[PDB]
Coordinates of C-alpha atoms and ligand atoms in Angstrom, one line a residue:
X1 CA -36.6 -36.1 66.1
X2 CA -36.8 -35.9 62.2
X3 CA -33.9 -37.1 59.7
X4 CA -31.3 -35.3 57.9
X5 CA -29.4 -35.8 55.2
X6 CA -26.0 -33.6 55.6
X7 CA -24.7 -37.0 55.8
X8 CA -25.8 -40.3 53.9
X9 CA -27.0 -43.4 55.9
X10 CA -25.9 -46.3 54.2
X11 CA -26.2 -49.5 56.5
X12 CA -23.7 -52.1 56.6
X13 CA -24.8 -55.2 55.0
X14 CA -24.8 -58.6 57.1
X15 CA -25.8 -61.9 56.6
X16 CA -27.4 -64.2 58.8
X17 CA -29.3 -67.9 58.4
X18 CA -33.0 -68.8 59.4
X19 CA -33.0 -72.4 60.0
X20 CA -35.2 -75.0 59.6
X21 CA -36.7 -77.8 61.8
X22 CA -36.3 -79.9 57.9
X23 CA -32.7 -80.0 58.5
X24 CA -31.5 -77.3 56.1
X25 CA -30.7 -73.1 56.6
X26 CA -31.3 -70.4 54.1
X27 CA -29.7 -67.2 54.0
X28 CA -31.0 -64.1 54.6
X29 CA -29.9 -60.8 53.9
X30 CA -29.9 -57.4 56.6
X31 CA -28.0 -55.0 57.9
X32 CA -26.9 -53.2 60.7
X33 CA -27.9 -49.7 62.2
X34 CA -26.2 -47.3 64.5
X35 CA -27.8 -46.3 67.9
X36 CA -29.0 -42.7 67.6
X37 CA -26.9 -41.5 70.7
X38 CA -23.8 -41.8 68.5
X39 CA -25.2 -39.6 65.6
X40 CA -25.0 -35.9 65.5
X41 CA -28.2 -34.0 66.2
X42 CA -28.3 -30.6 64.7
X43 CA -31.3 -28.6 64.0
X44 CA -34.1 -29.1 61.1
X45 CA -32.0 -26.4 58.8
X46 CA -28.8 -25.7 59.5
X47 CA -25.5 -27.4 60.5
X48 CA -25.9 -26.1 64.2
X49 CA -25.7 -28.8 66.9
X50 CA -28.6 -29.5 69.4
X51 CA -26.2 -31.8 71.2
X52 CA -22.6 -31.0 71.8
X53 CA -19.9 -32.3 74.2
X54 CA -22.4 -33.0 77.5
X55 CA -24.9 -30.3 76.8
X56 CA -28.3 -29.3 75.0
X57 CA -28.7 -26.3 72.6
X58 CA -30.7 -24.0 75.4
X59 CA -32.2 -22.2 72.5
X60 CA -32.7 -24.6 69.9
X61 CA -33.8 -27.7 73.1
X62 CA -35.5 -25.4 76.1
X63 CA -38.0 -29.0 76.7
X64 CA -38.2 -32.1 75.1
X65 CA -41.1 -30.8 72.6
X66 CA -39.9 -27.9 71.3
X67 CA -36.2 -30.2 71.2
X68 CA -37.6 -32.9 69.0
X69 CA -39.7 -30.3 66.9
X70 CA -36.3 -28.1 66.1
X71 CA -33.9 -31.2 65.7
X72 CA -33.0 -33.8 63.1
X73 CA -30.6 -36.8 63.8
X74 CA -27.8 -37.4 60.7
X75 CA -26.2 -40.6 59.0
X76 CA -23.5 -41.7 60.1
X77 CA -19.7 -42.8 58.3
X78 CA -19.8 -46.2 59.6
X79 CA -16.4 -47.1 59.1
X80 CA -14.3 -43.9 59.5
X81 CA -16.3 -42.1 62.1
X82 CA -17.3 -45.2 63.9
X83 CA -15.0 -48.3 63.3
X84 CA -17.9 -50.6 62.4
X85 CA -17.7 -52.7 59.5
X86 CA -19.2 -55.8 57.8
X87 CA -18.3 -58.5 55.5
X88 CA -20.8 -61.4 54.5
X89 CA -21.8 -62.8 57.8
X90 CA -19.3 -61.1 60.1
X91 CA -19.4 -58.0 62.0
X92 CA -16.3 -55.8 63.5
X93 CA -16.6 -53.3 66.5
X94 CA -13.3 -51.6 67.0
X95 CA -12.9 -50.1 70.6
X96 CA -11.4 -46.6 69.5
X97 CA -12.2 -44.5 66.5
X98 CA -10.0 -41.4 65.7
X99 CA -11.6 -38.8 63.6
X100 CA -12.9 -35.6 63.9
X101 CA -13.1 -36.6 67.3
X102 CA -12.9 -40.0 69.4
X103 CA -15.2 -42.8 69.3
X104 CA -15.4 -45.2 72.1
X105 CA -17.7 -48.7 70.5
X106 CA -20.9 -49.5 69.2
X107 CA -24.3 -50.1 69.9
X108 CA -26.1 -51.7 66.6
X109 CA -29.4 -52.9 65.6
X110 CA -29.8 -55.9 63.2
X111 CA -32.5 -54.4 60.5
X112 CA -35.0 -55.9 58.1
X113 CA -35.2 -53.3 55.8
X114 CA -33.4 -49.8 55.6
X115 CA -36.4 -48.9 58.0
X116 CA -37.5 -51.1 60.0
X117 CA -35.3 -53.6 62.7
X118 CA -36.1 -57.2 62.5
X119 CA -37.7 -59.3 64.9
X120 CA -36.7 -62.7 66.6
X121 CA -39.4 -64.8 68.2
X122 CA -36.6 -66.6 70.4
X123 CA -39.6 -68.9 72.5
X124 CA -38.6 -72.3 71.2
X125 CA -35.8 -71.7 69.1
X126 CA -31.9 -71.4 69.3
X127 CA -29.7 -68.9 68.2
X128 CA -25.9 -69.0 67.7
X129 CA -22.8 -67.1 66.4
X130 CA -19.5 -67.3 66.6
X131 CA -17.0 -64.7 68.3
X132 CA -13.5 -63.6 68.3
X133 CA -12.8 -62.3 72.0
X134 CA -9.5 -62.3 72.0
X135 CA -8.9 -58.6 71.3
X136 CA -11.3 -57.5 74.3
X137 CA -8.9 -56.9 77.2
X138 CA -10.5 -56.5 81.1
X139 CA -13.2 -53.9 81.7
X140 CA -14.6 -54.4 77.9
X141 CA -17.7 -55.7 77.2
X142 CA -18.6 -57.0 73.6
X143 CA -22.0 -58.1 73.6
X144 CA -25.2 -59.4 72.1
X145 CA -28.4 -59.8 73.4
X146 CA -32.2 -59.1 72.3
X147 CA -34.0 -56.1 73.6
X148 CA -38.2 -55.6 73.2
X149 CA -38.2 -52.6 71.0
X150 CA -41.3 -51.5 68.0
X151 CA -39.9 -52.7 64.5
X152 CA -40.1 -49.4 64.1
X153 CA -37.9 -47.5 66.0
X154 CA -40.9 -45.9 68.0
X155 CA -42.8 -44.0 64.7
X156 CA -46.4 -45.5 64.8
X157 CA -46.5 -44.6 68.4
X158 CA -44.7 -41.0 68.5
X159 CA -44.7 -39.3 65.4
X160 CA -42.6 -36.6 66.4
X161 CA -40.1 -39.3 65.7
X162 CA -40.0 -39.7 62.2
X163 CA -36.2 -40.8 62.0
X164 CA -37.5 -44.0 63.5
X165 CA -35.3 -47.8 62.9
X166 CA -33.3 -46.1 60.1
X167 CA -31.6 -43.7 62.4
X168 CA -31.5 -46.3 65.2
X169 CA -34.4 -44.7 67.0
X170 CA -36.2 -46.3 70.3
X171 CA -33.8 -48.4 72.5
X172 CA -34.8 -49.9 75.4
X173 CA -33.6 -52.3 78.1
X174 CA -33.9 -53.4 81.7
X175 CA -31.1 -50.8 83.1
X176 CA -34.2 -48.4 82.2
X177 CA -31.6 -46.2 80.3
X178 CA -31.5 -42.6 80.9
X179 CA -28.5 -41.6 79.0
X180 CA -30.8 -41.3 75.6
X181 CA -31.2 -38.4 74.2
X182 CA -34.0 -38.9 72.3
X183 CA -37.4 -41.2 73.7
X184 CA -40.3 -41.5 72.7
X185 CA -40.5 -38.8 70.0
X186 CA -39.2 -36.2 72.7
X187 CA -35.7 -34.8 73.7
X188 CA -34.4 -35.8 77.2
X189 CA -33.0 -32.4 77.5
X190 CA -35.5 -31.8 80.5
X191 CA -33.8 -32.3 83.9
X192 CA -30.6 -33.3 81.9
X193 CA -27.2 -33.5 84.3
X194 CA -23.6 -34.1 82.8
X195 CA -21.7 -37.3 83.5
X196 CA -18.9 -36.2 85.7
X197 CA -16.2 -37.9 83.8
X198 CA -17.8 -39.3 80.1
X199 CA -17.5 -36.0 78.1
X200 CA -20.5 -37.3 75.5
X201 CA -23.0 -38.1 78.1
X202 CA -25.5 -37.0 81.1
X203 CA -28.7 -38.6 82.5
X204 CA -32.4 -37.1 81.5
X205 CA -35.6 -37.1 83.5
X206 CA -36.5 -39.9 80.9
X207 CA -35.9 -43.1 80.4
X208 CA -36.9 -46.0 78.2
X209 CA -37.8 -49.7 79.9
X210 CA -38.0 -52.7 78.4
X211 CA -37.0 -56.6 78.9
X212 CA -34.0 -57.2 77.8
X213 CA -32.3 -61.1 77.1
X214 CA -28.5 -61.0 77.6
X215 CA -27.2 -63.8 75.5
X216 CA -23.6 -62.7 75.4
X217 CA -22.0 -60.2 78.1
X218 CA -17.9 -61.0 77.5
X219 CA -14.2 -60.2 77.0
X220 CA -11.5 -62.5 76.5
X221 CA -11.5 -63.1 80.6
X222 CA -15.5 -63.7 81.4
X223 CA -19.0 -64.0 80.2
X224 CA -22.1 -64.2 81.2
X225 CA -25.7 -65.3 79.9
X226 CA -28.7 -62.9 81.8
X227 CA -32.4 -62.8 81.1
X228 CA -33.9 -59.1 82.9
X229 CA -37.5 -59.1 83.2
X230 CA -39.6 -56.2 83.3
X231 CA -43.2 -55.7 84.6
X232 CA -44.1 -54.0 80.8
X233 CA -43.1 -56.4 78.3
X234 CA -42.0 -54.0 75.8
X235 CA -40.4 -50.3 75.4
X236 CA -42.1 -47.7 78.3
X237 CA -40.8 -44.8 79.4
X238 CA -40.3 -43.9 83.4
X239 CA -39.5 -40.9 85.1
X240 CA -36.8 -39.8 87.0
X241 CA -35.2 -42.0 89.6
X242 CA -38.7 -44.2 89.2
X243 CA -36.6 -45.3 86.0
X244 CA -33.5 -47.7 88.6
X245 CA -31.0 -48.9 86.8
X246 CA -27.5 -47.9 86.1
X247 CA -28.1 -44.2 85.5
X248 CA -30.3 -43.3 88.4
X249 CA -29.6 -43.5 92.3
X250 CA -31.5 -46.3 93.4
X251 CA -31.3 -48.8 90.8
X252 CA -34.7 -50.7 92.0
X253 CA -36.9 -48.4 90.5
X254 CA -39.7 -51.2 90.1
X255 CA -40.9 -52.1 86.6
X256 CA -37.4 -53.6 85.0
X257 CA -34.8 -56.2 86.8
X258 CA -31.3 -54.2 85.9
X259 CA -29.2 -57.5 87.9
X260 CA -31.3 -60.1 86.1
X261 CA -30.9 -64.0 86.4
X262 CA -27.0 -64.1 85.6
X263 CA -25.0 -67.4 84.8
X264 CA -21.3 -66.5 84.5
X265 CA -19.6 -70.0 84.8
X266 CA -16.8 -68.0 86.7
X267 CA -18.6 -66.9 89.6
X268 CA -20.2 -70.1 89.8
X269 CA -17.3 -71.8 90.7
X270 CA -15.7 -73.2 87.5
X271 CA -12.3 -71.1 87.1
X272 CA -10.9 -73.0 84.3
X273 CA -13.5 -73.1 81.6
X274 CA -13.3 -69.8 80.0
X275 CA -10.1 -68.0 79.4
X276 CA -6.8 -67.1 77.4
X277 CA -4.8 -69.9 76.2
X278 CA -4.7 -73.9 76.3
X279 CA -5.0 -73.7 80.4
X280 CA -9.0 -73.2 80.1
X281 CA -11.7 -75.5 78.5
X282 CA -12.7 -72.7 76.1
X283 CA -9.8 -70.8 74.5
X284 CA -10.8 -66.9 74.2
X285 CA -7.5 -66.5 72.1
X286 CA -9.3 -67.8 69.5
X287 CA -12.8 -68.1 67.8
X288 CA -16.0 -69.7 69.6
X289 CA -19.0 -70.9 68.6
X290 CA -22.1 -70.1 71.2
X291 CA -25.5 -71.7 71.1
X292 CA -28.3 -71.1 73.6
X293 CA -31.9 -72.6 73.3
X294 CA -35.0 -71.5 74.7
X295 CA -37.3 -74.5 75.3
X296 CA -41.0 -73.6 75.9
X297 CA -40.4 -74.2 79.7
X298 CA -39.4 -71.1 80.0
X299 CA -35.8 -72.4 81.1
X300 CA -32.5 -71.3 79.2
X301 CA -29.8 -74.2 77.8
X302 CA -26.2 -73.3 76.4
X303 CA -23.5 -75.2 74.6
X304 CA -20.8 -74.3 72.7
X305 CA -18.1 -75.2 70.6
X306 CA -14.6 -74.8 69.4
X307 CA -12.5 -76.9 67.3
X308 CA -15.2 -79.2 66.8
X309 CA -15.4 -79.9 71.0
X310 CA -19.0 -79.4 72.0
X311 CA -19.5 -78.9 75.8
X312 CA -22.7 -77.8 77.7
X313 CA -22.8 -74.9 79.9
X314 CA -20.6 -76.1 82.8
X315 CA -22.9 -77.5 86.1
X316 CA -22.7 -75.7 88.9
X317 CA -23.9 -76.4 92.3
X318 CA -24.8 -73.4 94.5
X319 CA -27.6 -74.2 97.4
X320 CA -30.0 -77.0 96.6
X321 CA -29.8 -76.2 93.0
X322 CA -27.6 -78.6 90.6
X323 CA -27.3 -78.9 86.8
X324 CA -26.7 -76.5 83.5
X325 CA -29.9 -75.1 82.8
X326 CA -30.9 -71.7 83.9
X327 CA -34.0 -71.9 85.1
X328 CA -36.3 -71.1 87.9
X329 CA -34.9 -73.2 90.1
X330 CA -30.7 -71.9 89.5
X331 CA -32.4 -68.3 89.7
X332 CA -34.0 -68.8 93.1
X333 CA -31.0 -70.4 94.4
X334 CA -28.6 -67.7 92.6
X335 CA -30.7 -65.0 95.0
X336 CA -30.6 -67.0 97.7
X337 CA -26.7 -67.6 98.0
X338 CA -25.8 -64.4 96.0
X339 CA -28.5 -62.2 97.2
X340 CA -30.9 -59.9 95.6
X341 CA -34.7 -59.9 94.9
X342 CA -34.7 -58.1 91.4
X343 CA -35.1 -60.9 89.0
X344 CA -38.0 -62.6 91.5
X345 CA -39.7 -59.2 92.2
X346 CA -40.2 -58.5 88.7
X347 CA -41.4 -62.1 88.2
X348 CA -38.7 -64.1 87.3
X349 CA -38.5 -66.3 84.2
X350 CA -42.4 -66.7 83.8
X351 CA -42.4 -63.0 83.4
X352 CA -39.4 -63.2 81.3
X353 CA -40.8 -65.8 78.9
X354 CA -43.3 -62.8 78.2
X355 CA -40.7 -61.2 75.9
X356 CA -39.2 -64.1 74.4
X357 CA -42.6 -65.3 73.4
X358 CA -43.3 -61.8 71.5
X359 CA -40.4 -60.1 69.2
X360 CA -37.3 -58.7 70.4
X361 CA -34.2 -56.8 68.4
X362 CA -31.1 -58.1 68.2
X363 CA -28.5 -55.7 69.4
X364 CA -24.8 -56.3 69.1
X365 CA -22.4 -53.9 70.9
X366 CA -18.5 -52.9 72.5
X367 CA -18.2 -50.8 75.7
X368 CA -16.7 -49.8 78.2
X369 CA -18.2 -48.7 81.6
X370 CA -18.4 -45.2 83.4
X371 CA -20.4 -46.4 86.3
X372 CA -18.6 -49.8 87.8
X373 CA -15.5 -50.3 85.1
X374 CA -16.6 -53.6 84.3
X375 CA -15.9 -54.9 88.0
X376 CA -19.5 -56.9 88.1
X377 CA -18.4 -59.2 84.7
X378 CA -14.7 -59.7 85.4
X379 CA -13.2 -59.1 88.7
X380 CA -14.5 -58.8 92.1
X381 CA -17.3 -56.8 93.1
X382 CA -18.3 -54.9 95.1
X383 CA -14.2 -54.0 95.5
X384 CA -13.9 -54.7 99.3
X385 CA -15.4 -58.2 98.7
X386 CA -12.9 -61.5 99.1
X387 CA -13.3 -64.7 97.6
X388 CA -15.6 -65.7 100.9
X389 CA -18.6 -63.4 99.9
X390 CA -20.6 -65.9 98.3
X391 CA -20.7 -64.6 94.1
X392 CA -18.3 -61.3 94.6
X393 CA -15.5 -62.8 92.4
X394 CA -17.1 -63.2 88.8
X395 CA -13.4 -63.0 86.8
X396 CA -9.6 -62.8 87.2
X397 CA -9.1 -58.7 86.1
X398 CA -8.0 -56.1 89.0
X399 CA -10.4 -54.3 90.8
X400 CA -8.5 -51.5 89.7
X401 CA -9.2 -52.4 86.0
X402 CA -11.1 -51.0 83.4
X403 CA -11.2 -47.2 83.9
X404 CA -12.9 -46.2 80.4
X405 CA -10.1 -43.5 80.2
X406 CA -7.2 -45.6 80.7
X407 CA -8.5 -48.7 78.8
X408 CA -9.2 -45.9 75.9
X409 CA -5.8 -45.2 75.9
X410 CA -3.8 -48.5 76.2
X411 CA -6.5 -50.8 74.6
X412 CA -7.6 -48.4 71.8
X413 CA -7.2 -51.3 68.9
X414 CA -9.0 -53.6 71.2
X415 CA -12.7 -55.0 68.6
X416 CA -15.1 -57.6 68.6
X417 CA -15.9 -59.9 66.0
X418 CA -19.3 -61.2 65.8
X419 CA -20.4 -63.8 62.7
X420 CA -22.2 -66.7 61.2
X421 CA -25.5 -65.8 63.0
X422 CA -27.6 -69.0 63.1
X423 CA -31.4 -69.1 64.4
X424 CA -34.1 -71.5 63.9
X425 CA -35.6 -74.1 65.9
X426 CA -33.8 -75.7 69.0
X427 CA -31.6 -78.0 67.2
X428 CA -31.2 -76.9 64.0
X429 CA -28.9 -74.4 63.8
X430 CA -25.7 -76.7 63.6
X431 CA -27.0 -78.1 60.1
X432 CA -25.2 -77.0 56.7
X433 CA -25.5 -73.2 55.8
X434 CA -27.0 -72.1 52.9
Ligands
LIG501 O1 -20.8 -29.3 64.8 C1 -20.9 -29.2 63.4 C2 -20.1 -30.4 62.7 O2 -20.7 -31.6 63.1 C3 -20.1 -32.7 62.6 O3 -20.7 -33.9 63.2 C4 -20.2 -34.3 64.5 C5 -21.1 -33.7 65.6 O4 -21.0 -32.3 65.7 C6 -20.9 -34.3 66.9 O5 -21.9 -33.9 67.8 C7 -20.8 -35.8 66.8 O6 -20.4 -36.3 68.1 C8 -20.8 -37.7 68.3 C9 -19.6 -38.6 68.2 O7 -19.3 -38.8 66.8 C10 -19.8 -40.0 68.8 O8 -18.6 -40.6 68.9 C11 -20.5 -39.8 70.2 O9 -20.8 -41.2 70.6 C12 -20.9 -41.3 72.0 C13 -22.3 -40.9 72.5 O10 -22.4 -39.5 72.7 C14 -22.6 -41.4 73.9 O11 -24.0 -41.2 74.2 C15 -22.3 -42.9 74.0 O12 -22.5 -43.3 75.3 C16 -22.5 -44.7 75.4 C17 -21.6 -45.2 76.6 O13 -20.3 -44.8 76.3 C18 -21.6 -46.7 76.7 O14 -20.9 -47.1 77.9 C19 -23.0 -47.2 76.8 O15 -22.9 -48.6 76.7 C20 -24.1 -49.3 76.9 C21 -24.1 -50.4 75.8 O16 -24.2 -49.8 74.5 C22 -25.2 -51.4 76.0 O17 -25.0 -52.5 75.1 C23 -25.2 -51.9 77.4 O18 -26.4 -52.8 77.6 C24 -26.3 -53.6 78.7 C25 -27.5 -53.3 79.6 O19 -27.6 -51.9 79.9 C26 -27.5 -54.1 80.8 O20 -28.8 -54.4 81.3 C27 -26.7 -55.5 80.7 O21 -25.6 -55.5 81.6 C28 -26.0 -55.7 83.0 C29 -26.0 -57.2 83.4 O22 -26.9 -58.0 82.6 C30 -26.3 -57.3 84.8 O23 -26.3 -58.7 85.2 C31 -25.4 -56.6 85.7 O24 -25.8 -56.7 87.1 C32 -24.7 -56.7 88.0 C33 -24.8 -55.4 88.8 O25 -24.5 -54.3 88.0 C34 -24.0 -55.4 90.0 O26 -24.3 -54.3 90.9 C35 -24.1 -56.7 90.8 O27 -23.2 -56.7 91.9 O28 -23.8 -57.8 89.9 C36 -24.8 -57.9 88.9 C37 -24.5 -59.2 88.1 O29 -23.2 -59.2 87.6 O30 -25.3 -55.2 85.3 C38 -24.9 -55.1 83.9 C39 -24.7 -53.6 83.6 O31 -25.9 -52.9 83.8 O32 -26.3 -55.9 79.4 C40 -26.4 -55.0 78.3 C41 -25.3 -55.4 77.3 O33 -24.0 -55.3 77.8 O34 -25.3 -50.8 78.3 C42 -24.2 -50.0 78.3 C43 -24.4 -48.9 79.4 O35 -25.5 -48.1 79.2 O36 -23.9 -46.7 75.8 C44 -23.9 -45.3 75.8 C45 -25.0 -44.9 74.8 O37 -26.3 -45.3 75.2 O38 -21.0 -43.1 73.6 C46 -20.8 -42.8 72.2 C47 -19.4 -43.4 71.8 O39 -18.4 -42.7 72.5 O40 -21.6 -39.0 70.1 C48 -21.4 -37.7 69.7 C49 -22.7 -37.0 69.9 O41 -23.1 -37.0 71.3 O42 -19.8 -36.2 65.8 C50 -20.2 -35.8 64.5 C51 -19.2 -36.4 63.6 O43 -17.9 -35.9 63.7 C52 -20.2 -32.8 61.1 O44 -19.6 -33.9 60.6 C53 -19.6 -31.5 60.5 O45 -19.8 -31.6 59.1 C54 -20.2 -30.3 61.2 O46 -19.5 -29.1 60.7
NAG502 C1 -15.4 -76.7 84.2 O1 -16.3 -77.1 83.1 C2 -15.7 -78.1 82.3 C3 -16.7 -78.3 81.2 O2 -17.9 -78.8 81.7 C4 -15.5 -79.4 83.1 O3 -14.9 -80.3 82.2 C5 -14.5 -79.1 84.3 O4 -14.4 -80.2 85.1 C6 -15.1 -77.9 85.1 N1 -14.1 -77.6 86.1 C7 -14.5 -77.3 87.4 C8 -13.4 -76.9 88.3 O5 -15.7 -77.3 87.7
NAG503 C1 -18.2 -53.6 101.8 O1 -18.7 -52.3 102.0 C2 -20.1 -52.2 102.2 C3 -20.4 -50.7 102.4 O2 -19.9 -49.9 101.4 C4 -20.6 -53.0 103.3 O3 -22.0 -53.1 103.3 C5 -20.0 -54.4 103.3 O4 -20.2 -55.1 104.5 C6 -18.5 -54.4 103.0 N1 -18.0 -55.8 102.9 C7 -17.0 -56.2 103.7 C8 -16.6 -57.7 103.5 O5 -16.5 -55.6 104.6
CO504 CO1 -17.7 -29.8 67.3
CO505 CO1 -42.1 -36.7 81.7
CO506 CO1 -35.3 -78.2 80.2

């Protein structure tokens, strides 16, 4: 797709600090992007849509080539269209927007530059932020995590894209996403099917691959740290139902891991760290500070903080495996009590410390979840699961909870607060600001 301009695109500022291994941080200065699946796609000279309500233009989009040729993607009104806003360090998702139409969420890239996203080397270093969870009721999901998309959005590679990083062109991650409307420099209007109940979205004959590192997956009732590996490294598009994932049939379409290694203290056992109120270790009623470092081994460590109390990722035990590092060892043991061979198919952390040793984006995001309402993060799951299936009880919520329709309605002040971003070299990223 190419850029247009009916609308400005002015990125929210935010703030974040490198750190040092010298003991000191320095600030630096970004912003954030929307993903382009949010943004109105129109064609090249007028004001009329390529996209609207579930469906492609079938004269403006009759395949993916002549689609990307004929439409542009617009700016976007960050705050009044999509309830994002900034201030210094800190960044606000609210759940639901009310404008010209609704808005459910987010899904935002930290930039470098107007046009390019930055990149993280996380191999060897820590990164942390603070959140406020305490407005993210059961079956919402405010997140953070890295993904291993081009700096640039796609461009150098396609150039039928020329909207590219500005216009929050060229997601990827392990779920192999289909939904996207737009991948690698070519509509997905080909073999496009409607979602039977999101009236935004449908699935494509593309999708767009890539490892993905889950630092933060939570609400104020669970959370859960998940590296996906993928047999490509980086962004790669798939085809059909080879894609797996969330949006096709059989979600082990090879190349990416969509289950991933997950550690959600929870469904390891420990009930009481993480919750609302003075009952839990961690109190999601009010702000947290979450670090997670990424020594060389390839193995993942967590801490966080709150008040000025620092504790480690609780240990869990769970088949020959004891401690509170993720590593190959807890992801081994996780598959063989859980079940599953994703994560160890597509080669398990070795594979994973692939991507962590190149680039990856930082991706922050609030949403809520057509395809299993949230169930896998903070209730029980699959439904007809007890407390005896070894890892089917991951959170307190209903099984009947989060239906993105009704949590739309009841919830629709529900936001995230994400802030004081922090990365640098394991243990530096608790030293004075700058
Ligand atoms: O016309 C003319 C006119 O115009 C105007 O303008 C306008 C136009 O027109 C129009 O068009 C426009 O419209 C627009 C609007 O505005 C907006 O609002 C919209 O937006 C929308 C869109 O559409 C859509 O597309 C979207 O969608 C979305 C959805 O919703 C959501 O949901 C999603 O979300 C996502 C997120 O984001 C992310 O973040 C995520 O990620 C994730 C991943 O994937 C994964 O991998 C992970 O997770 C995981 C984990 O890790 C694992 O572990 C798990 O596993 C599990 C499993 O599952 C189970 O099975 C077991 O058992 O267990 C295990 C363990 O536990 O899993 C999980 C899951 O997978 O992580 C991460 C993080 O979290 O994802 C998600 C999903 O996918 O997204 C999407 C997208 O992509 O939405 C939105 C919002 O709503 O749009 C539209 C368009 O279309 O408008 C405009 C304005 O108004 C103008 O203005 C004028 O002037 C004219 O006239
Ligand atoms: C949960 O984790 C906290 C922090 O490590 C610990 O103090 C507590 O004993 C744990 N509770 C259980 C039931 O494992
Ligand atoms: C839950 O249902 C699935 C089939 O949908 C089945 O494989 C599984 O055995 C069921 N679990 C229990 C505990 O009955
Ligand atoms: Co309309
Ligand atoms: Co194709
Ligand atoms: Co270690």
């Amino acid at each position: 797709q190419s850029a247009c301009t009916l609308q400005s695109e002015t990125h929210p500022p935010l703030t974040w600090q490198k750190c040092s291994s010298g003991g000191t941080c320095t600030q630096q200065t970004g912003s954030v992007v929307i993903d382009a699946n949010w943004r109105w796609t129109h064609a090249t000279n007028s004001s009329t849509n390529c996209y609207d309500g579930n469906t492609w233009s079938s004269t403006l989009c009759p395949d993916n080539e002549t689609c990307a040729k004929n439409c542009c993607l617009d700016g976007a009104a960050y705050a009044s269209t999509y309830g994002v806003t900034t201030s210094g360090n800190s960044l606000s998702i609210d759940f639901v927007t009310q404008s010209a139409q609704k808005n459910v969420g987010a899904r935002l890239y930290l930039m470098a530059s107007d046009t390019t996203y930055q990149e993280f080397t996380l191999l060897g270093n820590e990164f942390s932020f603070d959140v406020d969870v305490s407005q993210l009721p059961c079956g919402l999901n405010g997140a953070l995590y890295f993904v291993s998309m081009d700096a640039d959005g796609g461009v150098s590679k396609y150039p039928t894209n020329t909207a590219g990083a500005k216009y929050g062109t060229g997601y990827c991650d392990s779920q192999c996403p289909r939904d996207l409307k737009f991948i690698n420099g070519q509509a997905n209007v080909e073999g496009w099917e409607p979602s039977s109940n999101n009236a935004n979205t449908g699935i494509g004959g593309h999708g767009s691959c890539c490892s993905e590192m889950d630092i933060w997956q939570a609400n104020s009732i669970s959370e859960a740290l998940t590296p996906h590996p993928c047999t490509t490294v980086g962004q790669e598009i798939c085809e059909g139902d080879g894609c797996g994932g969330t949006y096709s049939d059989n979600r082990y379409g090879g190349t990416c891991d969509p289950d991933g290694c997950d550690w959600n203290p929870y469904r390891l056992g420990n009930t009481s760290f993480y919750g609302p109120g003075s009952s839990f270790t961690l109190d999601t009623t009010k702000k947290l500070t979450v670090v997670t470092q990424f020594e060389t081994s390839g193995a993942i460590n967590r801490y966080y903080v709150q008040n000025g109390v620092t504790f480690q990722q609780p240990n869990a035990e769970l088949g020959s495996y004891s401690g509170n590092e993720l590593n190959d060892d807890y992801c081994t043991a996780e598959e063989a009590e859980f079940g599953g061979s994703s994560f160890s198919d597509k080669g398990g952390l070795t594979q994973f410390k692939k991507a962590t040793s190149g680039g990856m984006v930082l991706v922050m995001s609030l949403w809520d979840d057509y395809y299993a309402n949230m169930l896998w993060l903070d209730s029980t799951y699959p439904t007809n699961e007890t407390s005896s299936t070894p890892g089917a009880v991951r959170g307190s919520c209903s099984t009947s909870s989060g239906v993105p329709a009704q949590v739309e309605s009841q919830s629709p002040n529900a936001k995230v607060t994400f802030s004081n971003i922090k990365f640098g070299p394991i243990g530096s990223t608790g030293n004075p600001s700058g």
